[PDB]
Design an enzyme around this catalytic site. Sequence first.
Site, PDB file in Angstrom:
ATOM      1  N   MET A   3      -3.245   2.325 -13.188  1.00 24.80           N
ATOM      2  CA  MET A   3      -3.335   0.993 -12.592  1.00 24.80           C
ATOM      3  C   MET A   3      -4.138   1.071 -11.291  1.00 24.80           C
ATOM      4  SD  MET A   3      -2.590  -2.240 -13.080  1.00 24.80           S
ATOM      5  CE  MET A   3      -4.176  -2.638 -12.363  1.00 24.80           C
ATOM      6  N   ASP A  48      -5.946  -3.199 -19.308  1.00 27.24           N
ATOM      7  CA  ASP A  48      -5.974  -3.446 -20.758  1.00 27.24           C
ATOM      8  C   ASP A  48      -7.333  -3.103 -21.367  1.00 27.24           C
ATOM      9  OD1 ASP A  48      -3.364  -4.407 -20.674  1.00 27.24           O
ATOM     10  OD2 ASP A  48      -4.009  -6.488 -20.389  1.00 27.24           O
ATOM     11  N   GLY A  54       3.488   1.819  -1.988  1.00 20.57           N
ATOM     12  CA  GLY A  54       4.134   1.984  -3.289  1.00 20.57           C
ATOM     13  C   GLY A  54       3.409   2.948  -4.207  1.00 20.57           C
ATOM     14  N   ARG A  58       8.090  -7.705 -18.834  1.00 14.47           N
ATOM     15  CA  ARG A  58       7.439  -8.032 -17.566  1.00 14.47           C
ATOM     16  C   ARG A  58       8.014  -9.327 -16.979  1.00 14.47           C
ATOM     17  NH1 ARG A  58       3.413  -6.085 -21.039  1.00 14.47           N
ATOM     18  NH2 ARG A  58       2.296  -4.239 -20.288  1.00 14.47           N
ATOM     19  N   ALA A  92       0.787  -1.227   0.000  1.00 14.23           N
ATOM     20  CA  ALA A  92       0.000   0.000   0.000  1.00 14.23           C
ATOM     21  C   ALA A  92       0.829   1.292   0.000  1.00 14.23           C
ATOM     22  CB  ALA A  92      -0.954   0.002   1.187  1.00 14.23           C
ATOM     23  N   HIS A 104      -1.713 -10.906 -19.825  1.00 16.66           N
ATOM     24  CA  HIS A 104      -1.190  -9.556 -19.700  1.00 16.66           C
ATOM     25  C   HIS A 104       0.323  -9.487 -19.947  1.00 16.66           C
ATOM     26  CE1 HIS A 104      -1.141  -5.376 -18.703  1.00 16.66           C
ATOM     27  NE2 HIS A 104      -0.243  -5.584 -17.757  1.00 16.66           N
ATOM     28  N   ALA A 138       0.506  -7.560  -9.240  1.00 21.88           N
ATOM     29  CA  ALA A 138       1.937  -7.842  -9.437  1.00 21.88           C
ATOM     30  C   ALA A 138       2.265  -8.605 -10.722  1.00 21.88           C
ATOM     31  CB  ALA A 138       2.481  -8.617  -8.244  1.00 21.88           C
ATOM     32  N   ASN A 139       3.162  -8.036 -11.526  1.00 26.39           N
ATOM     33  CA  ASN A 139       3.605  -8.662 -12.773  1.00 26.39           C
ATOM     34  C   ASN A 139       4.835  -9.563 -12.601  1.00 26.39           C
ATOM     35  OD1 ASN A 139       1.835  -7.885 -15.031  1.00 26.39           O
ATOM     36  ND2 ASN A 139       2.396  -5.793 -14.454  1.00 26.39           N
TER      37      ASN A 139
END
Lengths: 314, 314, 314, 314
Positions: free
Chosen positions: B228, B150, B11, B87, B9, B177, B118-119
């Site tokens: 995002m 997206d 970030g 990614r 939270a 993604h 999270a990627n």
Amino acid sequence: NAKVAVLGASGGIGQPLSLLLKNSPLVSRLTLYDIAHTPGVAADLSHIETKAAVKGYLGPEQLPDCLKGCDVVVIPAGVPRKPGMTRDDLFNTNATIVATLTAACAQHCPEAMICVIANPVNSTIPITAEVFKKHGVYNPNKIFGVTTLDIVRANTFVAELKGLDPARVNVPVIGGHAGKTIIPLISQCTPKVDFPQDQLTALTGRIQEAGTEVVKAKAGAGSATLSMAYAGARFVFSLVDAMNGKEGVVECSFVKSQETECTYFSTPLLLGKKGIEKNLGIGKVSSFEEKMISDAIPELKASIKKGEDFVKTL
Amino acid sequence: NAKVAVLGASGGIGQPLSLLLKNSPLVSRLTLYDIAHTPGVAADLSHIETKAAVKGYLGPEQLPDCLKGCDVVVIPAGVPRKPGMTRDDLFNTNATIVATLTAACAQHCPEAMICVIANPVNSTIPITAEVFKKHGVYNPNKIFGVTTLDIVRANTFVAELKGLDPARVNVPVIGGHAGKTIIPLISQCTPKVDFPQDQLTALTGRIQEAGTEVVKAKAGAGSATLSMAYAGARFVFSLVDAMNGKEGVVECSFVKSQETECTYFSTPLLLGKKGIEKNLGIGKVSSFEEKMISDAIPELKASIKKGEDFVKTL
Amino acid sequence: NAKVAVLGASGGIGQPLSLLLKNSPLVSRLTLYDIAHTPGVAADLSHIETKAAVKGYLGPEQLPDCLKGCDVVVIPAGVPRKPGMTRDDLFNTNATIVATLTAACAQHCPEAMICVIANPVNSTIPITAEVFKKHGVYNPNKIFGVTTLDIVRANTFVAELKGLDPARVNVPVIGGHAGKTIIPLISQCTPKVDFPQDQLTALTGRIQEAGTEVVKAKAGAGSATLSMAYAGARFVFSLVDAMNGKEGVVECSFVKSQETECTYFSTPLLLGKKGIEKNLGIGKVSSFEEKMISDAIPELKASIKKGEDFVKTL
Amino acid sequence: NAKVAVLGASGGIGQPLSLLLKNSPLVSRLTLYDIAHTPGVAADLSHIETKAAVKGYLGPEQLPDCLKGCDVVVIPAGVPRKPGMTRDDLFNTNATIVATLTAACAQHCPEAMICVIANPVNSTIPITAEVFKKHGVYNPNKIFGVTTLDIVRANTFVAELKGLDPARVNVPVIGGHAGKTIIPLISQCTPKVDFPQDQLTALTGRIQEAGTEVVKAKAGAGSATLSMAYAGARFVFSLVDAMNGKEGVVECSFVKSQETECTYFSTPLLLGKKGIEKNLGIGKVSSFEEKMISDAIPELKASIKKGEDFVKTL
């Protein structure tokens, strides 16, 4: 719909403030200004599925282009406090920031509504007025010191103590935005609330020092950003709704005022198409609340004088 | 009356996401977790005049207290991309973050909706699912790879080209993604749109590379954060609306699937009281779209196996 | 007399590295390049009481000016590791950075000594060489992969265990700079040191994972910066001294070679006026060390091919 | 065998400072303190091939262990300036930081040399002295306000105008470290130099505002870091050399003084084993330089009393 410029859009306040403005159907055009990061913030926000067209401008060379045709300019730009600092420790930096940016507004969008968040507001509003005076485009109905966060905080703290939904509480806050000058009118609160004096005094001091409380909590990582973004967007939304002919829109704000002996003061304002339609003034207050207004006026005068004196040295 | 936890939270994504969630009347409780800065972020947000109770948690001892009783957990935690990176380049760092955080979710709030931002999502959702299986609490109707950004991008870009209100545009996006796996179903857009081929190709490419576009624009200062935050919030709101019994709530998301030989896949999902009410599948698509699905499968499978294999090294 | 350019001078390695170079009598002119902050860095350093004239350049358009007449180019530019990452996770970004920057070198200072710090070195040197080949400006005696930090670490760790002064210890380290390609030749250590096999293995593994240990210790805040600046400085001072005619200057460095079946390898190199005077090769090694060399070769060749293949695709 | 502590070792000044101290054969123990990042900074520095033992300490609890048995304590900790700030604007924040850190020094290493880089030095040295007095361990010979950067700058600028090597230039600077209190004695420069009166005023103005010029050149990204590290390191080396019996070591420093009307003043000091061996005083100065001294005294006294008043209300 409104074109809104955010000066200092890449900062801690500016980024989430720009997000809230982009999310609103009241905004059709959103221009973002800073000295770094703006193109990236703008590209980011431009992907959001709302109608507001977003553009980022970088450096003073692009500042005029950012401001053209603006209906509202919000200025979150400024250095935040660290633990230990007073809001006045930021005066020197934020005064020259506000002076520089409001000069650009006076030259490029003098008819726009000017909303200053940069602290200390009790001096930066006077600075903004004097800068506008020197450009010969002075309009005291369109210059606002955003004190909305004080009202937002009072509503929350009252609601928490009384077990209410904060969204249905309204606490007028008047004076200015410092220690000191922050005067919550609990007597004028809706719904009507009832506190013992010791509990009322604690509640009052809590609202007065809430900014400092957040600085302590952030432990060197700055001051209020997210709640400040919320408060800034609320005020801009109120102003823009009013500009579109919505009736009954009242917000407290630090403005050019002949309500007290202070040339600048924060009171409830009826907003509309010319900005300030009517200063609703201080109204009926308690003896305790009246004592605070008197204690605060000395500091307000100094802050106004300090801000006015700063513009003369330029 | 939803209780929402945000893991990561403090970030760039987490802070504006937490603001949007705090602003919502759907949320009654907002718990914020990170390894740093959470008490300051929570103190900041707690001043906002909405009903949601906000609390910040810090460190491993407090993670369980953050998650207990949650309806929804959103996980924006993770390292962002720099220009030049894929990614997948983030996998080795973000896989460990997702493994640890989702293990805590499986223990302390196994019935919550788990929304992973999270990627690389194409691998971190498989990780999340395997972690839940290990704890014996795997429910594929409640684990979501948030691909909403997206769709939001597709809506925006379609609207810009045709001159529409993007609020009125809904483009289904399927696959996964990551560059090639993002498949905008323009043929299934509402309102129905017809593009000449050269515009259609540029539009489809733009949607696929939109994340990279923002990374480039930010020039080393991370990836999309504000959009995002918007997309993550939107997906949580849809999920909460569905849990409150709202009908016809449809969102695309990367989930456990049967549509192709890929065990995980993104399609439009009818949402309901227990999360996924019904997977609506791919449906009728163009030849061009069918070719894009065929191309995506090998990369999806590779990303899925990588995630599964990582869990087996733990 | 030397003019040294630092590409990536605003970064974590770049700023302290620029400080160390500024302090040296060997440097007459210090040009600093980055995409942000260089003017402030150059102004900071220009106040230091040494002869080197310092100038900061900003953005690719100014890169030609930065490079003209350079004797040595140092490239600390690139993204650092986060916990969990391998050096190959940085490949995509740092390969693109190195190919671009070395292409500018090949155009604007083809004669200069190219010292590459950007990781993974096992790939970025092959990249550098291929870029110079494509411009028809080939000199394999002037392209250096800076592996000095491995020697510096080996020296310190041996010295700590034997209770010696690290300044008076020398440990040749050969191979490359990634995991098991880092081969410290403890048998060739001066002074002679006696380690049993169990301690020898521990010491070797420590040297091999030293960079990873710093990444872990920095817990998200990057990789080695200060020690890397030290080692980068040491190598640039050795090279410049050799260019001044200083005799018997030997440093290990990852260069194009025919000492093993790898076309690129790190060995002790006698340096001179034209860069590499003579490759001193591996010399006599223990059985333990021979095994490590053999086990390293597959990984080195793969990294080399990866780097070379990257340039061919552009 | 000098044990040196760096309080604020993770900051912009602290990290390059710590590097320079680690590179020196004079230091045998290097203890690093801050509220974040020190384990990683120490890990990084511990790999350098010098004998100084490096240890990182974190948080107030580990501060006594950091300071234990120290010979020198260097305090670069503090909030840096942003464009538009005076050094006095930092007072409230940095006064609290210095009072806290020096109190710990007085409690745990009262016989160490105390070197304060934290601004505003004109107030923070008085704070240090009063804190030490409050603990009854006041020694005026061991407390130093590091003004060395003013001398380094003066040497560089003189050398640039006169085409000299700045390494062989020495310009005494006296007074304090803020605005007009910075008094470069060009008349006492070695080698002897003559400047026309117009250049002298320009040269003097440049030296006085050199710190501000770097702040502006960094455009919000802080103040001088690398040159400050160089200057901090030079002063610590001088002081450590003198403690090992090196003779003829002279440095200007803001210290407790009976040379003027001010309680504290910067003049050339002969350093010895006891710290201040002899205050060498202002000496013979020109009418111009005498005028500056006269103009400066009122500001210095104000800064001095300000710092004294701060400690008197703790």
